RNA sequence: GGACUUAAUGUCACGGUACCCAAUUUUCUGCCCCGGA
RNA sequence: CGGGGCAGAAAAUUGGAC
């Protein structure tokens, strides 16, 4: 008779249960799966306290398995005394069932035995079981038990036994994956525990008979698991987030009372990423301020919320908090804010399943099993540490509705997507999921399994049970405590190619190349080799990649792991085994294992040297290896390119309107973030484009639901029902250490189509990585295409990546400009043979060239009549205005049939022109990028230098300004709507009626829908709700003799300009009483040397600091670019055609200082191309001359219809522009005069100032004064004057 | 609102075409969909309001839902269980609204009582019969008895008069309605006048309209429901009804999808026990003449023989189903669209050769098996050609099975050195049936041909032990054969060529003396032969020989496959492709636990590839039944290349196989071989 | 020392991966002439 | 006798499948 205490502590989270009565737990289903937990019962009616508690009966289970297992090892002895096979069934009459009713198999051997265990005698075993005692199935005086287990209660040693149950456990939801289609089904949830501070339980047992004390205690030694985690058993605030949610509500209020609520999400779940920052970027105010004027622009930080700014804000409330920290602060604050606008804004299948317990007539059994005699027993330990090559992201649910303790209604989702972490933030891999991954593994290695049912009535005896019933793992925690990043994630509307409603959500990932430590312990007789299949499978080396996934969104790439520094141990539990109880197993001392030497290791533990190799299993071979395949190869891109990130825009201090996209690459030497990022193209852009490349190839893009449908896309890319069969991963750039200046700024304006100055508001730059031509950049990425795929899939994948090599589809954003343009595909020399001559097959075979008949330089052959002004006056007499305006219409056609983006119809044409351009007069194109780049601004403050725009120190021209220049002659040419108008002006007379949006025609105002219609020129080049369906790209400087060399006191290569300030709108209407003439345009002259040979003493204290300094380019110079078109017709290549080169004596202007005369250029057409898509996959040709003037003569007939007129026959017509008026007066605009022997140098002047001018000569009285009064120029007059061009203002 | 009732309007229409049987499934699905999420949203745009009027619409349309949801289960749907109880939930609230019309309190009230019927139907523990008892009180107090235009009051009133309520009031326009059926009235007419001649007409009716209408409808669960009920209350119509109901089934059943094919509703099982019941019970009798007793013998046999024919399977099997060209794209095709038709019809509108059992050569007997699962019996039927001469047994085996689990599980982790509990089975198998050692119901010194039941298959009958102190085995003094079925004889006489062929695909030289005898064939491809070259047999040759592996499939038997150099010929494949192996006899090296999956419950009926070699022409083939060593099958291999002329049971009996006392091992490995096939 | 808090000849819950589908993108020329105490 | 404008606007922030 003897009473000992003994102590139980947890090394790993445990599981906790609600306490119902015996006969009310088959009430709740809960109560009844979780019959092996700890339980948990309330201290009072409607209160949130309790305490805890296990039960001695579940012990007392543990121990006798244990029992039975020490004397099975042992071939049925202990310490030399024979045990009996005891007794474990009961007759259902005379008597009653037990409480339990064991379903599982029973270890037995053989008796070698002489007495019946009596009440005179009994064997060690038969005293451990109640057999012959005084206590039955009903307690009633505790006392007659032989031996007693008592209630283990949890240690308060310190104070407060008022334990709350929010502080000890929290809630978490698991689920089932089927096997075949990836998705899940049937989830459940429990409760978990911390072990760190609650973690000791104490409770007593006692023994009365001598015969079983040595017994008893080596099987408490031996027990290794309880409640669902290891175990060791030894033998001795409310105003905080209150406040902050009241002042997301006023937020929330002052941001609907301006009309900015969607605006929310961009205050919320935004700043949350200062925890990032720290407390110094609010302690300074270093935030990016806004200008927008120079004064007071807000750039988000400027707001109504009911007392001072949002920038008189936070810097004032961190100091009032400085409680809950930085990190805290921020992430409340946000979560407050998302949770209440998502609940101001906003069937069946949910089957959350828990398995039943069984109760029926004859199907309980008893099943003995007896191991052959001499047959030996082992234990193996496996060490190591997991590295993450890719970033990770385990899933959880939001954290009000994780509350333990509490929980008309249909399904409504969140779209936060957090990430799993502990009570100290620090990153977690849970038990549960690295189980799933090994079982899904061994299923795939041996070939063939079960799918887990859950009723088990008797257990599965197939080949992965048998194993995984033997396989035991740890939870594993790391040592870094940062805030993870945040992916955004949208999808794109195949029909407008534009962003799609209600598509737009975000994700929280880890950082790649953390560690977590790796345990993995298997108990049996061999060690398989499936198992060893696996291992090596997982593990990393030697040019091999670890093929461990793990978590969610395997598709995107995420989450593959490498196993490294693996070690493997042995026990041996047929003569070591009282080291084994002594030592404990090693439970909660591992990493000493993993960092120990080998000396130092204890007794009966070995290292084990017969681990098998790569290439001798015959798994791993035929299974594993074939399971995923390699492609990886590198892209070449020469331009600009910009992924562009908001967030980081709006927050860094650079004050940039947008920027580029990096991540955070964590470092294992030296333990710390390396503070260099990376730039990178996201995974899923990838992922996106070799899908729409795909679903456009073969047609099944434009289906309008996926809902059951089971089409090539839903085969290969999988859909909501299967998982997808290739994943793909990111591209990274890899030659960054080449550039003295890896990124560049780059300015961009709109230019309104009336006045030809820049537009309010719409001023904005961007801040791409800086590519060339002569010095692209380079990414490299890969992607895994699972086994089974027929040669149709194959050839589709080949197809795509020669698609994407060709150049159709661009990378990041603003790709109609010249941006993210692939220039070539390098695929690597280790991927598979049959891959590589598809792509040679595939690849483009010999175009069907002209034999250099009518192949060369397409020229025009077109004469325009003229004006007849200027042409009979040689003497260069009359004076003209820079500029006249052009009016047309009003009768603009619309249309509703809109061609979509998702299908190359057979009827349509798509290639790709190549074209030359020659400039006439000097061209400047300034660089914004330095304000002072000729270094000037010394002695001189105050006046802007700049230079000839450049990346890498190679002239080019941007394709913006083209792509605007076209997009202008187009309208013209079309009778379009104006894309760019300034709706909202007054004009004031030294008060008039309406706005300046008044006076213009219904008719041209620009197309706010798709339903109304779109006019040619938004039908062509694009709509906010309409992306384009043309492309241009950069030119590049290839020949020309050098700059315009001067000879005066500044660089040879410099000029000075005059003064250029503020169009005005209120000079062509007079006063209330007439419209606006149109589009304006300007004229070819050579009037640039006037500001030459006035240069030197042009600066002589006239112009203090209103001019500029900039260089400039010589005539004779050749740029090159190329344009790009898809589903087009007939007509409208025609026009653009006609529009790229109207023909001889007719060219264009581009570049700064145009009313001066600087800047002609004009384009000529080298090449054509045009690729068709059939069923037989043809390829390229180049086209000859007869079918572009059918072209060019289809498209005449087109305008010709669309003018009306009936008088006039339609036919082969050889093409004469000149007939229609407004294409006349249009041509009339871009004649060159001084081409030929013609030279007729006209003079084209502003009026000067009155008297006290400075150029001003003596004569016709040329100024304002006399052309300003209704004496000398009626308004009509001068409306006709302005409305009519090469007019002479000379008399 | 004034835009509330043009929705409830327009929405309305998509409601009420749902009662058009015309339109298919597919569509069915996608229209009700549309139909319950125009009214659905409007549930969370208006949170805490509505003109109550269209509330009873969410329940009502919700009912209809949890039709097309049933299906794509296996044993029970966990979203039919959804729909139901959330349709609870959206009329509970809708009855305590305070409208006060009558129309709209009566609607509501028949749509939860229906609801509530369908959900005890479907859930006992979740819906009491006292609740539905109250329920129903109370909607016949609101006045819910229009039978002349609305079947549910039909429905509300006979599951009230089942339950115990007088409703003397409302038969005549009960029985006068035309909107009732044959069961209702046969229902009507036992129930409340207690009498038998218009119930039996009326039911009879009933079951020869059961004919023409598949598996997938309800009439056959409410006809099994009501004749359980006859069968509780001791009458003595059910034992005519269960007998005409089973032939009215086995009538219907023959629809030759791939020649075996069912549906696997839940029941078919009970209905046969019942049927084997009521015939028994009826031949018990102390009839003047035998001629009947015979006759009512013969029956059960035919009975347990058209049970026992083909097997059932399940949605998610059927589904992921592999394919050939002949017969997977049509027949299986066909039969999914049949069955989902059936399924959704009756809850929108209501409205070789066959051999003969006594065709066997002389001095043949013949064992019928049959495990009654209604009341835990087995039974034995026994028929003599010479006597012409019918019997039958009983025995219990409940001990029988867990003997056989323990065998099972001890086998599965210590293949050889579990020897020991093959004689305890065997010893079991012997004492359990003593009525195979008796000379009054098997004659000694004849050929005895087995047709087991489910877990039956897989016992050694052919190497039983007597219960006594020197008992000896059955094989002794018999010789016996196997069978899957009855149905599986066919005749065949032996015209074949005399020509050897020889198949060799292993892992280890294991058969070095083989493959290299002189007698094999020409075509032998003993180097690694693939699933192609088995197909280059067209001669009819007398032996051949298969060593291979096996792989075995858990759920579907038409995907397990026979190992081969390649991706593997497969059930449906060998079923397919083999075309040239008629009237010989096949070999097979050593499996039988490789390819049928382990099994759980009492009951199992997976095939292996035998009966598909069976199913192709083979007359016989000759397997182990658990795993051995390669000398014995090289042994047996060589034996039967040296001869065909002698028996097995001689050769298992001359090799010492009898000495199970003195060397297990010995016993285990030598009773492992068995004959399957009828020499006719 | 004890209830709140177990029942004893029978607890495979280490019997279940929060799992599947979606391109931060569409559109826009770093341009320029009359004035008002 | 005198004089600088613009340094972004407009939309999409979740839908389903179980
Ligand atoms: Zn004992
Ligand atoms: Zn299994
Ligand atoms: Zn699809
Ligand atoms: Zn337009």
Redesign the pocket.
Known sequence: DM?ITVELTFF?PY?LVE?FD?DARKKSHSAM?????A?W?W?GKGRTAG?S?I????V??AV??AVEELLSLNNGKWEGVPCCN??????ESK?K????????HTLQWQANNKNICDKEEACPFCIL???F?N?????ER?KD?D?????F?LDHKQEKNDLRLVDIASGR?????DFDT???????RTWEADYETYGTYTG?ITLRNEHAKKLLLASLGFVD?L????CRIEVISEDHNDELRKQAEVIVEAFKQNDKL??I??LADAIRTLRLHGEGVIEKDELPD?????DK?H?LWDIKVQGTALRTKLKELWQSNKDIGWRKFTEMLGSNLYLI??KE???????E???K?HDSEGS?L?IPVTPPEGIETKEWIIVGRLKAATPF?????QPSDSIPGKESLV?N?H?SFNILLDKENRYRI????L???L??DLRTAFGSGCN?????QI?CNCKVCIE??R????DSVSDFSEPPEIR?????NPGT?????????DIEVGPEGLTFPFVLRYRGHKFPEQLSSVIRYWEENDGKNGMAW???????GKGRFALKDIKIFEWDLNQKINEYIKERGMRGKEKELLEMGESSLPDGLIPYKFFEERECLFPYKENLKPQWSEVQYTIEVGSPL?????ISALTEPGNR?AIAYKKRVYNDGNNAIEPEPRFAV?S??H???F??AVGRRTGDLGKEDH?DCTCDMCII????????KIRFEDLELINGNEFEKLEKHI?????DRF????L??????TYPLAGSPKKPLKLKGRFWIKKGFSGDHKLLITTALSDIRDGL?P???????GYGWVAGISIDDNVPDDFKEMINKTEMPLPEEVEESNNGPINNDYVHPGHQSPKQDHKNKNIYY??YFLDSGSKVYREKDIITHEEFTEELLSGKINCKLETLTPL???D?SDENGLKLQGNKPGHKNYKFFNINGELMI?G??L???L??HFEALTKSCF??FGEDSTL?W?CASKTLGGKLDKALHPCTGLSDGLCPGCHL????????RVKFGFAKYENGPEWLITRGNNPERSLTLG??????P??SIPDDESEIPGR?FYLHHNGWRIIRQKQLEIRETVQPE?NVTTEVMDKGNVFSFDVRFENLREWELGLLLQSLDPGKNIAHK??????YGFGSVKIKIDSLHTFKINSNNDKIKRVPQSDIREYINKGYQKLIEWSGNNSIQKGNVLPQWHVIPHIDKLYKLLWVPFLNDSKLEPDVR??V??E?SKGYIEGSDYT??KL?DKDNLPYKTRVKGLTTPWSPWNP | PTREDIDRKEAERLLDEAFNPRTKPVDRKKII?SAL?ILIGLYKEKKDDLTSASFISIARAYYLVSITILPKGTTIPEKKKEALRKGIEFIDRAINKFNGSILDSQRAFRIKSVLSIEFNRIDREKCDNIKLKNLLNEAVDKGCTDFDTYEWDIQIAIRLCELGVDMEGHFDNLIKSNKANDLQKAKAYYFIKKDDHKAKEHMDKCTASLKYTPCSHRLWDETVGFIERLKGDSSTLWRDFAIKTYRSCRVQEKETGTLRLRWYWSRHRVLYDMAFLAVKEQADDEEPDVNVKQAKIKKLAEISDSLKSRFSLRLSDMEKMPKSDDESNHEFKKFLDKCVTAYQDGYVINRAKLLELTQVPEGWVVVHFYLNKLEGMGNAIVFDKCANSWQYKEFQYKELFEVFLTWQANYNLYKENAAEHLVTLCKKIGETMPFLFCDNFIPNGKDVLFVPHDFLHRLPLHGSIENKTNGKLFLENHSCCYLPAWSFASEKEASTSDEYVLLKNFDQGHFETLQNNQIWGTQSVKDGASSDDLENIRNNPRLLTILCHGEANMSNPFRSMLKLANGGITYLEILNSVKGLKGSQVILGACETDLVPPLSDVMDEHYSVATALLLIGAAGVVGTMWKVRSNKTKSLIEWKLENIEYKLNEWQKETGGAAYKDHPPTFYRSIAFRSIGFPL
């Not at chain 1, 069932?97 to 599982?104: A, D, E, T, V």
């Open positions: 009473n790993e599981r306490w015996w799966r979780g019959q092996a937990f339980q019962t201290k305490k508690f039960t001695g009966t579940l007392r289970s006798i398995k005891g007794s474990f069934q009961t007759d008597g069932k037990p409480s339990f009713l064991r379903k599982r079981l109640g057999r005692d206590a039955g199935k009903v307690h505790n038990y031996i007693h287990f008592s209630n209660d939801i698991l689920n089932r994956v990836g998705k899940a089904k049937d989830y459940f007593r698991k409640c669902g985690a290891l969607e605006k999400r961009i806004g200008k927008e004027e120079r622009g750039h606008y998502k804004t906003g069937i069946l299948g949910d089957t399943y828990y398995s317990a309980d008893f992201y385990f899933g959880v649910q399904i989702e779209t849970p038990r549960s999921a189980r799933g991954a079982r899904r887990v049912s859950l009723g088990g257990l995984m019933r396989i035991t793992l740890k955004y994630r949208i999808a794109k190619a534009t962003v799609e409603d209600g598509s737009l959500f793990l978590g969610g969104l395997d598709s995107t910009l992924t562009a990130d908001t309107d996201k899923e852009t992922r996106g484009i899908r729409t809902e890319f999988g859909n909501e029902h299967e998982s997808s300015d961009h304006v709109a230019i006045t030809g100055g820049a309010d508001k719409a001023k904005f730059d589809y990378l990041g954003s603003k790709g109609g400009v820079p500029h400047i194109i300034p914004t941007p913006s300004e792509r605007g220049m997009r202008t894309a760019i004031s030294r080049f694009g709509t906010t709700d309409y992306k384009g003064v250029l300030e503020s169009p005005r209120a000079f304006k209103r581009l570049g700064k200082g145009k009313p502003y009026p100032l009155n006290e304002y004064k300003g | 969909n999420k």
